[PDB]
Structure formats: C-alpha cells, structure tokens
C-alpha cells in the first residue's frame, strides 16, 4: 500500500516466499535492497576450534 501496488495473490504452497517474489515486482531501490538482504540472510557454517 505504500507504493500503491495491487496486493499480491499469494496462493498456499508457492515455492517462492513473498519477499523473494516482491523483490522482483517492486521498482524502488532502497526497499528492494533490504528485501534482497532478507531473501539471502543465511547462517554461515564454519568450523572453529
């Protein structure tokens, strides 16, 4: 609603989570840079000691 876009039809069980499907459908740059960090925020499995 902040950008005036139509609210998304998100069916049950789509393989794309609705932040991973709204970084492609949004056309801003700063709220499409935060939605890229949330879509690729992962733990980094390193072996220490």
């Amino acid at each position: 609603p902040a950008f005036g876009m139509q609210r998304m039809h998100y069916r049950n069980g789509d393989p794309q989570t609705p932040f991973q499907i709204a970084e492609q459908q949004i056309q801003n740059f700063q709220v499409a840079n935060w939605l890229h960090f949330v879509n690729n925020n992962q733990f980094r499995q390193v072996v220490i000691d």
């Binding site: 039809h9 998100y10 069916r11 049950n12």
Partner: protein, 49 residues
C-alpha cells in the same frame, strides 16, 4: 366348446431372479480432504491465503 387338447398352452418363463430396486445402496463413496478439493481446472478451490 371346451376342446381340451387344443386349449392347453406351454407358458415359458424363467427359473429365478433376484430383483434389486435401489442401486446406490451398494457403492460407498468418499471425499478427499477438502483443502485438496479440485475444481474443473486442476488448481484447487479456495487456494488463496
């Protein structure tokens, strides 16, 4: 006149039947889980979230 020999007749019918009136008392239908209920196209009714 009651001519006896010219008035007998051989009535031919069957030996045994088993007449069943109602037929849908034999099948036992079921239903899949209504969240997996499918319309005429193979997506599901009430799919959205």
């Amino acid at each position: 006149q009651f001519d006896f020999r010219a008035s007998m007749h051989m009535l031919t019918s069957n030996l045994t039947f088993t007449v069943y009136s109602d037929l849908l008392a034999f099948v036992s239908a079921d239903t899949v889980e209504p969240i997996n209920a499918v319309a005429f196209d193979n997506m599901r009714i009430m799919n959205e979230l």
